[PDB]
Amino acid sequence: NPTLFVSYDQNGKKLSFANWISVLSPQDTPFVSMTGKESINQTIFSWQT
């Protein structure tokens, strides 16, 4: 064990992480943002023209 303590000699350390995460992903959904939703009952829906 050296008498002079150096950074490379330390064993107990606190990594000090960033405390968060950078996702950097796109979540825009321009089409779904518009086109108001509508609720139904059956698994099939129809309309007349």
Binding site: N1, P2, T3, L4, F5, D9, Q10, N11, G12
Partner: protein
């Protein structure tokens, strides 16, 4: 952690020009957990008998 080696023979002249003593760091000791599981699969008919 631990202190220096077996001590003794510490006699230094008034001027010695200290030669960068050799302090030593700590020692890291780690362990891991272990899972203990006990499962019981009993029927329902047996859970009503006497």
């Amino acid at each position: 952690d631990a202190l220096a080696s077996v001590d003794g023979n510490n006699a230094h002249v008034e001027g010695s020009r200290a030669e960068d003593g050799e302090m030593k760091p700590t020692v890291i000791k780690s362990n891991v957990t272990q899972i203990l599981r006990k499962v019981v699969r009993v029927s329902d008919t047996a859970n009503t008998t006497a």
